[model samples]
Target chain A: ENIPFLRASTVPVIEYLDELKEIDASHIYTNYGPINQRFEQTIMSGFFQNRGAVTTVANATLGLMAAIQLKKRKKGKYALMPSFTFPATPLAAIWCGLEPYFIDISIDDWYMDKTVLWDKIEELKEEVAIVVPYATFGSWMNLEEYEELEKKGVPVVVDAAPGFGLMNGGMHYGQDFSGMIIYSFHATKPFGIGEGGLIYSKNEEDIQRIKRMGNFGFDTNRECTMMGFNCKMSEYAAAIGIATMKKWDDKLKERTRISEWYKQLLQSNGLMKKGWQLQKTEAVIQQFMPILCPEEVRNKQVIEDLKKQKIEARLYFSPSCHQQVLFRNYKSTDLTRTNKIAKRIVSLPLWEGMTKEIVEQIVICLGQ
Target chain B: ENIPFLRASTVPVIEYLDELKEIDASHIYTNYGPINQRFEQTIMSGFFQNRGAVTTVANATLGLMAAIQLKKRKKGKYALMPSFTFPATPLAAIWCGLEPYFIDISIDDWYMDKTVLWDKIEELKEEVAIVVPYATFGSWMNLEEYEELEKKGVPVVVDAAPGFGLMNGGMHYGQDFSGMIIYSFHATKPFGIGEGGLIYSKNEEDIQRIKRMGNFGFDTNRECTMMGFNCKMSEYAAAIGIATMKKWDDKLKERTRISEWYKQLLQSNGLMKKGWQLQKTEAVIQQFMPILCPEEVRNKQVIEDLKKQKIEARLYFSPSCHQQVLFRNYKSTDLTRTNKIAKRIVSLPLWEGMTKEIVEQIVICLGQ
Candidate 1:
């Protein structure tokens, strides 16, 4: 009952400060300093699976924005993205001088509605400058379809913010993308490296541009060659990331175990058979243990009840991007399906070091 | 001989990590967390000198971007700035969907060339949505003139990026302004907090807007009413900043001593008399002890000779913002003086713990 939502990997975070001993001596705190590059390399090897050249940033929004800035389109250009995910999706596009065009998401697949992508392809194709898809709720999708986008002159930057732990068959969901993929290391994210982001791209040139762009577009000669901003991860955050890497495998293992327990407990309790279900996906690690309640289930009431019981349950991004007041003006497809399903989402208390008892308590609470 | 051009405040940085020991227990790593807010309050109390509200960001570039985003104009607007500043000034404006217009700097004061401002105001007034002024080379000037601007339908955001130490009659250079003022805490900055920025505004409403602007514009109800990106500083960097505050006075004192040494060494001899000059300004602590070499003297050769002697010297910003390849496409006024001055300006190795011997050695190197 007293449990909090999403506890941080703090012991490892504290240990991560050791990486700064060298930086403390070097007196270089940021600007893609040594520790920053080292942290990026680890992100390259571990989460990104060494599939691309990586540029770490201060936050995932900046990474997404930097990747979208690669668009050669001038004004009136549209950045096509899901309206069901974070506001960062459209805001990044807006920051990059692109008009945001929100795409609808699938209630079934719980991702960018593939049907709409094909439907809007012709009508919105000419105006669409970039296609930024999010691995919604850490749910991966038919990303293969996105590969067809660059052919139409639209670059894709997938927001795999909380999906770092997501793997499909042996490959990371975002690894196979021809365009850039960004990961968040926010305190609430699965990676949880304080506040940071990694921009990964298969193309070396794109990665180079991102690296330069994140550091005020300064080249090796320290000359500004592009209209870029500062998004460099500080040595302190990078050091925290480096420390988190040491226990990465175990952390993911723990999350996997808890995810399995949630399923087993729910099924044993007959909640799974009753249409009260946990999200089923091939995502390697469940970033959020989101429960899908059937049509009659009131998510707000459940959250209120859970809060009254002292359990920290959250309905993250329930409003969806298009539904948010800030994005009322942006053009979006009818989000009736996602808007409906968005009401049923209940993210239970989940973080590293959760005991079987804690999972049992949460499952029992859900059953009640 | 092995001295680097710039080094961060390490002792305080190391001590700052001690503050994180508690965050380890709490598990909050980012957002406007406790330490992040604490550091911001300290900045409000200290650097801002309590004139107004202040908020912290990932860096000063984002600070300026967020501040400029509050401009009364929507899109198709112009952000007027000096050509003789860092590219970040224009980059922030460009990111905010404003057309960047570069105004020339006053050759005498080395700030926004005001004569051009009055002339261009009528021609560009309707188009001009925002005015961005940089404390060139961390030199503050003519901010009082900006009070005239708001009446002409333009708001100002002074980019005192590295000019935190700039003081006039005990007021921080940025404090007296009616509009927003932003400061950088990068590794090379006078008040280095690794990678962070402070946004200060005299008007509470503007500061509130900036706070909302930085944290994805989320209001108290968690409703994002405005398009905002993630520019929030990490608890780690803020903790470092909290520690840096303890040593702020000492670090600036050391820099002041070095500035006096440069002037004494150069002026006592024939160097200052012969036109080798330290930048003279009301600004107290010199972030970079910039030596203005006469037009007859080429400062580039001096850098080569200094490097040859293993005493590190830097030819900084040789190509000022307008001369940068990135901004060549942007509109600009005459930058003839700054373009010439760019080639002659050199930054000697300046940091805390720097000796008079080092300044003398740099002076002799300059004399040669």
Candidate 2:
């Protein structure tokens, strides 16, 4: 276990403890206390650098469930999302009583296959209620087509769980996309509060709805109206998030440093040859180290080689949602491309404060 | 809101921060890491002392949901619980896809009415997949009858949420209660880690199942086998809990002192006369402060009067499950006793470090 798959929650905890002290002094720990409110405001302005609405929850799974419910998740509808993403994506949909239909990812970009959506929209649009397009491995996609589907009266709840500091061009991921964007601040995430999630949207009503949904469906009139569960981020957790939010740029730059080192080391190892490379992202915090391996190299062998060298790595999303035993009964699109690409991917060591020596050793060990 | 209905997360946070520092240094903030595992063991041995199996969750609602699911919850079955209790008990049953049927509480002791349970059990044994009998503000009622029902193949999931440190005769709250029991550790509770919950049982399998269900359905080998959401208790929260676990007796003792003072003052002032009475609990940590007004007085007007004098009070379970808008579709038993008690019950301010002066002032203002 030379290097782990994900680093732990790091924060300047002295400041965080101080914020918790404020919460203790004020006699309010959860239910959107001063610390949580400040975090929502600070993260909204600091991370996205915008004036919009954001509500924090216990975790991304609950946040997405709340988000979909806010978007009106009905029983008979299908929650259309990519199967190549994390299990929580579809699991959230399932919890909201929506039958999850896994759409395959494209071989070209590993994003949700556009063909499936375009072909099935007419037949499934009326029956499909929630569309969760994930920013796979924190990579932002041009979501113009998803927005096109939205105007047809479907609410696009983007799964930007790992895309906190992601951006391709002018704006951040999900900012200009004009749909509800959700982010995870799990301890393993790039920027985290130990265990937290945030929901954002241009629509103020959706943001408010998400807030109400998290707090036991308490309406403004002190009445519990909606079917809501407790999804509140405790002030102690939010304290860490708020403190970490202040150091956003520094943390992301450190992550970017690790990614750049990975890029150079992987390229020299010839793993980046023949269009086989690390998925490209711009101005985005590389929250993970998913390497898209080529046809010649079996990811299994590479992972074993790393293991023999005592280096830790993982097979994330390999048995993707469409392939997992739990979701096999659910309907899915053609996985021709997904089945091929899924096996040849491995997420290696990546975290803040990782040195060039570690990255170099990981590349050399795997290349052997 | 001079003396609020509930106090904030109270702990000896200095040592708690030290444990968090260890979590930071180890780079294992969650996923049942060193700190969380330590908490689960220490709290079980220290608090209950005779635990067969226990698993910690994010909150009481999630704990109850996971406990019921572990107890083999089936769709379209009824989760028979009392309406004269916290909304979370029934809300969790509904989350497991079981229709919630509200049973009435006893006028004799404000516990779950047994006649309703017995009549319904014989009628709906197979369909009653879950039975949650709340402790009624941590009141230690004899659970011999609940055990009797369990022999009939009913898995009685006891909602001893606020019953930590509570005892009657000799054993603790969940000690004599043989079925699965759930506890709450919200910030407002007698002792909390800001927000957390615990599940306990005589069976090891149920405990293990609860653990798996809380952790995104992950098996011991990191396999996601069942339908589970993210109900994980973060190490950040757990660290505080572990630190506070060592201080349980001290906190509860302070609560006991406050409760004794309330009883003495109320009796001497003639406020506990005739039908007017203080909510009684035996060998219990007064986690809450509730009073039952006489038949002539309105509890709502008393709350308003307390507000006028700047003393906080609340009407918990006043609306009850049958009164809530969220569970409007759910069925219920005869609420005659519940209706009578629910209207008069008033939870006044109570906390650790609460002074007798505050209690005296609150009583004086309410009586006037």
Using TM-score as the measure, which candidate wins?
2
Which digits, one per residue and each the tens of the lDDT, describe model 2 over residues B233-254?
Answer: 8888889888887777788778
Quantify all predictions' global Cα lDDT against the true fold.
Answer: 0.78, 0.78
Query: What is the Å distance of residue B146 in model 1 from its true position?
Result: 1.6
Q: Which pairs of residues collide in model 2? A: none
DockQ of 1: 0.70
Clashes by residue pair, model 1: none
**Residues A1-368, model 1: lDDT tens digits:** 48887787644445765676777777777777888889778767776667668788889999888888875455437877787787788888888878778777776657788778777767865677777888877766656788777656667888888876567676766775778888888878787878887877778788888888887889887888876888888787788778777877777788889888988998997887777865545664566688877568888887888787788887766877777898878887777877887888888878888998998888888778
The digit string of per-residue lDDT tens for model 2 on A1-368 reads 36766765478567577786687677777788888889887866765667568888898988888888778446348888888888888878877778788787887568888778667656775787778888788876777887887776777888888878675555767774557888999888887767888888877877887787777777775567877778888888888888887777788888888888888888887766644566644445676788777787777777788887878788777778777767888987787878877878888888887889999988887666
Tell me the lDDT of model 2 at A182.
86
Find the 10 residues in a row with the least total lDDT in model 1 chain A: A9-18
Q: Candidate 1, after superposition: displacement of residue B21 in Å?
A: 0.7
